[PDB]
Amino acid sequence: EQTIFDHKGNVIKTEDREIQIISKFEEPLIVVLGNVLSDEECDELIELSKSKLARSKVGSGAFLDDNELTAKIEKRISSIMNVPASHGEGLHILNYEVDQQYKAHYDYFAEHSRSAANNRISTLVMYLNDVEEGGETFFPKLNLSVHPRKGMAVYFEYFYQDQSLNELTLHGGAPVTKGEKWIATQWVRRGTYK
Q: Is the peptide bond before 28 cis (omega within 30 degrees of 0)?
A: yes
Q: Is residue 90 helix, strand or coil?
A: coil
Give the integer Cα–Cα distance in Å for 104 and 184.
17
By beta-carbon proximity to a second copy, the closer residue of 19 and 64 is: 19
- Distance, CA of 84 to CA of 131 (rounded, Å): 31
Q: How far is the CB of 63 from Co ion (least distance, A)?
A: 14
Task: List CB contacts of 53: < 8 A, sequence separation 6 or more.
Answer: none
How far apart, in whole angstroms, are the C-alpha atoms of residue 50 and residue 94?
11
Residues forming the site for a second copy (CB under 8 A): 8-10, 20-27, 32, 34, 130-136, 143-149, 152, 177-178
Residue 146 binding result from a second copy, Co ion, none, given CB thresholds of 5 to 8 Å by partner type: a second copy
Q: How far is the CB of 180 from a second copy (least distance, A)?
A: 13
Beta strand 133-134 with 144-146: parallel, antiparallel or unpaired?
A: unpaired
Angle CA 41–61–82, to nearest 5:
55
The 78-117 site mask, x for binding Co ion (CB under 5 A), equals -----------------------------x----------
Q: Which entry of Co ion, a second copy, none binds 107, CB below 5 to 8 A by partner kind?
A: Co ion
Q: Shortest Cβ distance from residue 53 to a second copy (Å)?
A: 32
Rounded to 5°, angle at Cα 2 from 33 and 148: 20
Specify the residue, 41 or 107, whose C-beta has the smaller distance to Co ion.
Answer: 107
Q: How far is CA 41 from CA 48, 51, 129, 149, in A?
A: 10, 15, 11, 14
The residue with its CB nearest to Co ion is 107
Task: Report if residue 41 touches Co ion, rule: CB under 5 A.
Answer: no
* Residue 22 contact among a second copy, Co ion, none, beta carbon within 5 to 8 Å by kind: a second copy
Smallest distance from a second copy to CB 22, Å: 6
113 binds, among Co ion, a second copy, none (CB under 5 to 8 A by kind): none
Residue 134, binding choice from a second copy, Co ion, none, Cβ under 5 to 8 Å by partner class = a second copy
> In this structure, are residues 70 and 122 in contact, taking their beta carbons and an 8 Å threshold?
no
* Residues in touch with Co ion (CB under 5 A): 107
